[PDB]
Design an enzyme around this catalytic site. Sequence first.
Site, mmCIF file in Angstrom:
data_model
loop_
_atom_site.group_PDB
_atom_site.id
_atom_site.type_symbol
_atom_site.label_atom_id
_atom_site.label_comp_id
_atom_site.label_asym_id
_atom_site.label_seq_id
_atom_site.Cartn_x
_atom_site.Cartn_y
_atom_site.Cartn_z
ATOM 1 C CB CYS A 10 2.706 0.845 7.129
ATOM 2 S SG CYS A 10 1.071 1.367 7.704
ATOM 3 N N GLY A 55 2.116 6.002 9.472
ATOM 4 C CA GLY A 55 3.517 6.048 9.074
ATOM 5 C C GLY A 55 4.335 4.900 9.643
ATOM 6 C CG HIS A 64 -0.591 0.259 2.489
ATOM 7 N ND1 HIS A 64 -0.525 -0.777 3.400
ATOM 8 C CD2 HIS A 64 -0.134 1.386 3.079
ATOM 9 C CE1 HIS A 64 -0.019 -0.257 4.507
ATOM 10 N NE2 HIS A 64 0.228 1.040 4.366
HETATM 11 O O1 LIG Z 1 -4.149 1.428 8.555
HETATM 12 C C1 LIG Z 1 -3.363 2.061 7.863
HETATM 13 C C2 LIG Z 1 -2.021 2.493 8.423
HETATM 14 C C3 LIG Z 1 -1.981 2.519 9.938
HETATM 15 C C4 LIG Z 1 -1.344 1.531 10.666
HETATM 16 N N1 LIG Z 1 -1.194 1.526 11.998
HETATM 17 C C5 LIG Z 1 -1.695 2.554 12.675
HETATM 18 C C6 LIG Z 1 -2.384 3.634 12.076
HETATM 19 C C7 LIG Z 1 -2.892 4.735 12.806
HETATM 20 C C8 LIG Z 1 -3.524 5.760 12.163
HETATM 21 C C9 LIG Z 1 -3.698 5.731 10.786
HETATM 22 C C10 LIG Z 1 -3.222 4.687 10.046
HETATM 23 C C11 LIG Z 1 -2.540 3.608 10.664
HETATM 24 N N2 LIG Z 1 -3.654 2.421 6.591
HETATM 25 C C12 LIG Z 1 -2.703 3.094 5.694
HETATM 26 C C13 LIG Z 1 -2.911 4.604 5.709
HETATM 27 C C14 LIG Z 1 -2.733 5.448 4.429
HETATM 28 C C15 LIG Z 1 -1.661 6.527 4.578
HETATM 29 C C16 LIG Z 1 -1.575 7.436 3.349
HETATM 30 C C17 LIG Z 1 -1.351 6.636 2.071
HETATM 31 C C18 LIG Z 1 -2.403 5.540 1.918
HETATM 32 C C19 LIG Z 1 -2.462 4.645 3.160
HETATM 33 C C20 LIG Z 1 -4.972 2.163 6.042
HETATM 34 C C21 LIG Z 1 -5.093 0.741 5.591
HETATM 35 C C22 LIG Z 1 -4.045 -0.198 5.369
HETATM 36 C C23 LIG Z 1 -4.552 -1.446 4.939
HETATM 37 C C24 LIG Z 1 -5.900 -1.458 4.845
HETATM 38 S S1 LIG Z 1 -6.621 0.044 5.267
#
Ligand SMILES: O=C(Cc1cncc2ccccc12)N(CCC1CCCCC1)Cc1cccs1
Lengths: 304, 304
Positions: free
Chosen positions: B145, B143, B41
């Site tokens: 990830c 961030g 992603h």
């Molecule tokens: O969940 C997260 C990251 C994340 C992880 N741990 C904690 C998090 C806390 C807050 C927000 C986000 C978090 N995603 C990525 C966020 C986007 C950031 C910009 C570019 C596109 C992706 C959404 C998805 C990934 C897979 C399925 S839905």
Amino acid sequence: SGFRKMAFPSGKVEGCMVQVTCGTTTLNGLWLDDVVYCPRHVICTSEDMLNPNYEDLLIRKSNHNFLVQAGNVQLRVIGHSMQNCVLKLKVDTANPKTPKYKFVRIQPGQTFSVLACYNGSPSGVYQCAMRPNFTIKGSFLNGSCGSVGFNIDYDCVSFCYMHHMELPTGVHAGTDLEGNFYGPFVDRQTAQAAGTDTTITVNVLAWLYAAVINGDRWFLNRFTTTLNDFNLVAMKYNYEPLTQDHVDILGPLSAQTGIAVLDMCASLKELLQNGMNGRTILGSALLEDEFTPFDVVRQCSGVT
Amino acid sequence: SGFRKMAFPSGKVEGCMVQVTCGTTTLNGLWLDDVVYCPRHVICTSEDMLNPNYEDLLIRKSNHNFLVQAGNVQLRVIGHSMQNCVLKLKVDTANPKTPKYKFVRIQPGQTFSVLACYNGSPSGVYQCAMRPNFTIKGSFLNGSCGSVGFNIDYDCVSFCYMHHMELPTGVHAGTDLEGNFYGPFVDRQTAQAAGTDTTITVNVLAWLYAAVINGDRWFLNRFTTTLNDFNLVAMKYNYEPLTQDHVDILGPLSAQTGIAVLDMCASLKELLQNGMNGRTILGSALLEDEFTPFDVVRQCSGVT
Ligand SMILES: O=C(Cc1cncc2ccccc12)N(CCC1CCCCC1)Cc1cccs1
Ligand SMILES: O=C(Cc1cncc2ccccc12)N(CCC1CCCCC1)Cc1cccs1
């Protein structure tokens, strides 16, 4: 989201861990520049610990009696001195992995990471706090001495603790990197009782703020309190007195959540007077006090 | 003595953390040899996440659209591929800090250390477990990830997890280092409920053994039970069923403490049926399930 007891990455400190042997005793040393810091009881046998006279025991030691090993290579000891309860072993090689560092003496309630070591090799890392009675609730076996406590600010490692002792009560005692014990402990195998282990109120409040940020809000009540009223309850529950300095330190968390510090104090007061009723806060059934307000902000903001 | 939620020293994994940017998205990558592993992603915008077609999104990317930075130096991307939910970015430089490593897929109940990172820089290390519902209760912000979960056996780092997601419930989901999600989760911003989070019984038993070793013995009762009787109670309390494999795995702890596994099961049964009554076990008011029998033995023996 989520809130974990998080330790600083240990890499910078792993690069400093060496093994120090003197006679039949082996413990850990911290190699910074051309000096190896280790507990002075490396010169003692198990029998010596009952009543050691470190100055006299040290007279019978020469540079060549201290064996320093970094990885599988031996370091040459070209000088040795005793500073309070630590020995400074001057070696002929400066540590190529020396990070930027400071030696700081922390106050009770302050948290740090420990890199538990055995035979100069790192075995684990955990987060702990200097208790108000000057003990640390660590995880240390025989041979862990010389393991260090530290904090990291970007690239600077602040060394605050060196492990020396386990009290009969299973709690731990140690020194700052200048050899001075935290609290009234002495490096003797003698009856030493720790003193009242009070709860660090400011840290509990910080952790309640972390819970609100992370979604656990059930404990929030409709009450407020004063510093004096709150402290009457805090004293009864063996909680440290809360000062205006602590209220000031919780200001940013108060601002981020919109919850005034004294309102969070009233919520804490009811949690103390009524218990949790089988409920949890951040997956814990007791009030956590080993996160400072700085740790809560750091973890919730993502400081690297 | 003392028992702490301990993570493996993170140094070996810190040396692998790089920053991966694609367009406006920035996350962490794991640099092992001449390959950088990161969540796929990284190619998505926040809008793309609702319904991403990774293959189609990837067609519009070339090697030069993936920016890899290790420290303050940029790595040259000479190839890219998608393996399940991870991208493998082939770089022209092999990581000089590559430790000995394996990619393993762990089972629920198994514990690992996470090095939480932001912009390729390590910010903290904590110990967690793969929940029986295939989620992890981590501490991750936007961030994070590409942060990884790992175990260390002497010098070999077994990478078992790569962080990808936060579910609406605040729990985390991710893949092994082959891109396969743990559990039924998909890398889409869509309604995904985790499933029942059961307690890892074998780990609770291991931690009860650690408590006995470390002196907390108040919970020891005069009863015994059978696997079938114990499991009737374990099911009622949302505890995982205990198997003969689990009894076998607890054998060394049973031997060290002199407490038969089924006697420890009866003690656990009464703790479930009667609660703690305001008491603690290893300073905890709830039964801890994020220490495996291997972790208890490792910590109590001092494995480096
Ligand atoms: O969940 C997260 C990251 C994340 C992880 N741990 C904690 C998090 C806390 C807050 C927000 C986000 C978090 N995603 C990525 C966020 C986007 C950031 C910009 C570019 C596109 C992706 C959404 C998805 C990934 C897979 C399925 S839905
Ligand atoms: O407490 C320890 C180490 C220790 C630390 N943490 C945890 C420990 C667990 C078990 C045993 C020991 C532990 N001392 C050192 C043990 C001797 C080993 C052989 C050579 C002479 C010293 C005893 C004292 C030091 C200062 C005052 S009494």
